[PDB]
Design a protein around this nucleic acid. Structure first.
Ligand SMILES: [K+]
Ligand SMILES: [K+]
Ligand SMILES: [K+]
Ligand SMILES: [K+]
Ligand SMILES: [Mg+2]
Ligand SMILES: [Mg+2]
Ligand SMILES: [Mg+2]
Ligand SMILES: [Mg+2]
Ligand SMILES: [Mg+2]
Ligand SMILES: [Mg+2]
Ligand SMILES: [Mg+2]
Ligand SMILES: [Mg+2]
Ligand SMILES: [Mg+2]
Ligand SMILES: [Mg+2]
Ligand SMILES: [Mg+2]
Ligand SMILES: [Mg+2]
Ligand SMILES: [Zn+2]
Ligand SMILES: [Zn+2]
Lengths: 238, 94, 56, 100, 51, 82
RNA sequence: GUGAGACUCCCUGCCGCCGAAGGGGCCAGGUUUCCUCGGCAAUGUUCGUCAGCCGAGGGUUAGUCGGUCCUAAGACGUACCGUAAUUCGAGUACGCCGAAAGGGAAACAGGUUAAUAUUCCUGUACCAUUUAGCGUUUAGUCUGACGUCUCAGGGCAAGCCGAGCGGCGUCGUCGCGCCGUCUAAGCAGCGAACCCCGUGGAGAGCCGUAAUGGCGAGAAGCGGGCGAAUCUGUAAUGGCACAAGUCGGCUUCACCCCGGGACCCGUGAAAAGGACAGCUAAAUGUCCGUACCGAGAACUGACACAGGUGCCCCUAGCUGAAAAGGCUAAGGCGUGUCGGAGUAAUUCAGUUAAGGGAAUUCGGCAAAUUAGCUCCGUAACUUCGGGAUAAGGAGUGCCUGCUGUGUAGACAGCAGGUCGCAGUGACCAGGGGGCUCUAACUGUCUAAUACCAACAUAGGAGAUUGCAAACCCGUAAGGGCUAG
RNA sequence: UGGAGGACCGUAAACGGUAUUGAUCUGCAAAUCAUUCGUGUGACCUGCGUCUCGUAGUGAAAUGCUAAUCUAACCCGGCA
């Protein structure tokens, strides 16, 4: 058994690959709202989220529950966040995407209604509402894909705060090191061609090279799915 | 009013803290980012250039205490302002 | 720093404590188990057939 | 108990008296950098505090009105004056003091 | 000044009082046949397996 | 079950009698409350306080201060120390 | 002196060692090595009357010091479910543990022993609970409770100077040098900054700071409130040669208080506990640890081991930038436990060396050169940041008298005189430059033959995946990535 | 004026381990010593606690490290 790969080590769940969950502020999700209900809350603070490197808003709701929300750009302390099917479609409000006009920017979008918000959550990203239909509503993802969602899926109106985070180059291994201390990701990473053959499919050889094509089949088993996985194509576009 | 901007000194800007490290391209990028982020930013609540970054994406007004979530290095992005202008045009039209 | 006598000066702690049940200094202080009698793992006494030879 | 044999400090006292007078302290005796012997921030602190106290007392005792006091205060902040004597000389040459 | 609990110190005390010579009268009674025992030790050697 | 074994009679233990204190070897399983009650029932003198220590012989020594003056001497004479 | 026996054990003196560690304190660890007496067969690299050795006896005292209490990363238990099954397995629920360096109710000074002492004794305090009486919520907030860098202000242990007083030393001449001249907690009093409140009305601008700054969305100025370290008194009679014991000044780290600023694609714990309504009295405060070493002999490496654990936390005077190095205190030692003798070669480590100056050698390996600080001056090239201490020059001691800056400590500068071969006089302390290869750089690595051009890195590019995803772990229950 | 930087010099603080191919090589030492060196505000060093391990773990990747053991540890058993 030429040793297991880094991906298999991470799947094992060892401490080297686990997130420092105790360092994080909140499991960001929409407040739980019953069918045909609404809740209002006011923003009391804007805090740094170590798990995302983007601000989060602390919201005190009418029901006596205090919750951390994924902050949209422009959300300010003292703002009244409304969440409901009848809520005004305004930045920071959590409304169903069936009530959002075409061309509006949404974020923290539920995969299914009441899911808590799955898509469009990183700093600066946003989704655009494209079409409305009777049972489906379509949005353009930050990836460019068109996603057909239930119109009852809730989303906060606006874009995610923290835009331009990666415009500043790391410039230095130490800065990225400090970012990686709060993440599960292993830093730094050794290239596979630099490893021995017992440690990677690409390892070994008198000189550094994979020895086999780096595009691997989608059928390849664990310990073998390395390099370009099921690549449609390779190279820079001609 | 500013530093002794010598005959050659106006290139590194705040990226002079890095010396000859990291290449000219990324030093220029970081220097431009610092210049844009250190600029005065007008408060949307009191309308004076007193908005400073309190954290990564967190901005506060030194006068009125207005704190909000914005860009990482800029209080207001162009996409967010586009959203605001779309909603404002809709509101005006009706 | 040599793997020999130098690193052996850091031996100011323990991995095994005295066992309540059997008196052997075999109670792993981390796994909370006695590696001799099995105390802290089982209500029975740790015994294996391979602790002797096959009786033939 | 036998007497403690201390370290006598008399010849250090003679040297310290000479150093107070400004002797035995030349370039062949200096070993630390100029900056370890006189830190620059402390120099600035004493200089600006002397200038500011002088300006404050001049404004208090009626020799200096608020308009010229403000400009003199900013000038002192700008390193225009070496000491209190330089500031007084500028005051007397420019006749900025409201003499009576 | 390591910190022992009651039982650890009791076991150390037993180890200490075991580290005594056989009594002279026992040697006389046994006619020099019992002159030592296996629990003799020195404090500065292979330590106790007690605490 | 008496916690008191016997008076400790060493030089330092005998120096207590001139300050009205008396040192006993006691059961190591017992505590200060049991030692106080046992001594007060054993000799009928009120005990002001108990000081206790464990030794490297595995014994527990208790020093008892008494309320009534001369009580340490009276108990030490009753036992036979003095 | 002791002893049968003395280089080796004890005393005095002299001469030395360490003196930012070889001293002081203590963790883990050790486990009686601690103290006294008696011994010397073995141990001790020699001897030994000595001893961490041998034998006998003794020694550790707590409401206030720790543990104990709290929770952290993270374990463990029960249940559920899985598993052929289990002492096996992830998750969930409920519990429970997890820090003698995190949080934390409260005690100090002096004396006493051979060995314990915030523990015993004296004196003077304090905290918690229960009970009894006297009174009661403000209730949910605050505190506990927080990163890195930098700086101001205030204080203070230590340190230093002058005067008086009391000892000791020196005394060839002189009148200097050293030591001491003390004083806890508790209790009471004052309160700097910040913040807040009341007045005030400030711009062809004013007010501030070390710096950033502040201001009609209310500056300066004027009153008030809140609020520190510390200081003052009291405790003031305790210890001191019942010797003095009285005063001033300077500075102040590396400690305390307080406030400001800057940085983060990094955001820097939680919970117990505490405060916000308590006062008086009585009773109670159990359990465990406590000796000693904490290392060139008490730990660990088989050792009384030049390693490691620990340089972990502390440290007086002069020189000096300095905790460097040197020379000295205090304290610890002459046990980094063989001595004598002084006479070859050889050898380990040093000092010096005519004339030459890399001719040596694979190769300037090794050694030598330079060296601090101030001033002048500084090239190609360059990513404009640098190269740079480039290079290359000059000065430097002592004495006498001064000048300037500064509140001060001090710092900077001048004039004159003068000695030596030599003034950073010792100590300490770059040799420099040119042309190429290579990797951008700081970083990582073959513990014990490879510190490299190898690894990493930022940057550049590609690939998969819209999340019941991609990728990965598990036999399953279920998981990592993912509080994404 | 200000006080940034995986900035500079530098400690026998700490960490590392260049060269002497020196001492030592039945050693003080089963990897130490001397001198000479590299880092020394940061991808820093380090105490204690805690977790990850045998076809597994850990590895800025040398087949390095996982108790003087590593191209599959160690103990016992299969095993005479
Ligand atoms: K691996
Ligand atoms: K890599
Ligand atoms: K002690
Ligand atoms: K490139
Ligand atoms: Mg393969
Ligand atoms: Mg090994
Ligand atoms: Mg059988
Ligand atoms: Mg010395
Ligand atoms: Mg001998
Ligand atoms: Mg006790
Ligand atoms: Mg606990
Ligand atoms: Mg000899
Ligand atoms: Mg390199
Ligand atoms: Mg490479
Ligand atoms: Mg350096
Ligand atoms: Mg076998
Ligand atoms: Zn504003
Ligand atoms: Zn057991």
């Amino acid at each position: 058994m030429g040793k297991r790969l880094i991906s298999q080590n991470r799947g094992r769940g060892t401490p080297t690959y686990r997130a420092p969950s105790h360092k994080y502020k909140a499991d960001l999700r929409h407040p739980r709202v019953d069918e045909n209900s609404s809740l209002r809350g006011e923003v009391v603070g804007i805090e740094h989220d170590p798990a995302r490197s983007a601000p989060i808003a602390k919201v005190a709701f009418e029901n006596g529950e205090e919750l951390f929300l994924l902050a949209s750009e422009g959300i300010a302390v003292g703002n009244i966040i409304e969440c409901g099917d009848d809520a005004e479609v305004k930045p920071g409000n959590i409304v169903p995407i069936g009530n959002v006009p075409e061309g509006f920017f949404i974020c923290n979008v539920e995969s299914k209604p009441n899911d808590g918000g799955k898509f469009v959550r990183s700093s600066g990203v946003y989704a655009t509402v494209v079409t409305h239909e009777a049972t489906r509503t379509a949005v353009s993802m930050p990836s460019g894909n068109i996603k057909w969602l239930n119109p009852k899926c809730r989303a906060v109106v606006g874009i995610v705060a923290g835009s331009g985070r990666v415009d500043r180059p790391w410039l230095k291994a130490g800065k990225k090191y400090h970012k990686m201390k709060t993440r599960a990701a292993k830093y730094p990473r050794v290239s596979a061609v630099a490893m021995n053959p017992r440690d990677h499919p690409f390892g070994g050889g008198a000189w550094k090279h994979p020895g086999k094509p780096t595009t691997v089949s989608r059928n390849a088993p664990p310990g073998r799915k390395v390099g370009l996985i099921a690549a449609r194509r390779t190279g820079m576009k001609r | 009013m500013a530093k002794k901007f010598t005959k050659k000194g106006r290139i590194s800007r705040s990226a002079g803290r890095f010396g000859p490290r990291y290449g000219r391209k990324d030093r220029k990028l970081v220097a431009d980012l610092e210049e844009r982020m250190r600029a005065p930013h007008v408060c949307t609540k009191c309308a004076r250039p007193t908005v400073e970054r309190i954290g990564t994406g967190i901005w506060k007004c030194s006068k009125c205490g207005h704190t909000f979530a914005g860009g990482t290095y800029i209080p207001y992005t162009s996409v967010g302002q586009t959203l605001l202008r779309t909603m404002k045009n809709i509101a005006e039209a009706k | 720093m040599s793997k020999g006598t130098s690193s052996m000066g850091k031996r100011q702690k323990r991995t095994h404590a005295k066992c309540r049940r059997c008196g052997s200094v075999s109670f792993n202080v981390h796994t909370k188990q006695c590696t001799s009698c099995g105390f802290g793992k089982t209500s029975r006494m740790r015994t294996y057939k391979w602790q002797a030879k096959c009786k033939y | 108990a036998k007497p403690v044999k201390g370290v006598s400090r008399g010849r250090a006292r003679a040297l310290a008296a000479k150093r107070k007078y400004g002797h035995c302290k030349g370039h062949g005796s200096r070993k630390g950098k100029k900056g370890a012997r006189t830190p620059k921030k402390e120099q600035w602190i004493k200089k600006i505090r002397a200038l500011r106290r002088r300006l404050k007392e001049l404004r208090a005792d009626g020799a200096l009105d608020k308009s010229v006091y403000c400009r003199l205060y900013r000038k002192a902040k700008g390193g225009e004056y070496r000491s209190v004597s330089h500031l007084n000389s500028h005051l007397e040459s420019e006749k900025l003091l409201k003499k009576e | 000044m390591s910190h022992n609990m009651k039982g650890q110190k009791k076991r150390l005390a037993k180890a200490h009082k075991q580290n005594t010579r056989v009594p002279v009268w026992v040697i006389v009674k046994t006619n020099r046949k019992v002159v030592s025992h296996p629990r003799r030790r020195h404090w500065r050697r292979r330590s106790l397996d007690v605490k | 079950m008496s916690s008191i074994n016997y008076p400790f009679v060493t030089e330092k233990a005998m120096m207590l009698l001139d300050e009205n204190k008396l040192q006993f070897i006691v059961d190591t399983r017992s505590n200060k409350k049991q030692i106080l009650e046992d001594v007060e029932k054993m000799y009928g003198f009120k005990v002001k306080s108990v000081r206790t220590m464990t030794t490297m012989k595995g014994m527990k020594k208790a020093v008892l201060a008494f309320e009534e003056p001369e009580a340490a001497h009276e108990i030490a004479t009753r036992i036979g120390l003095m």
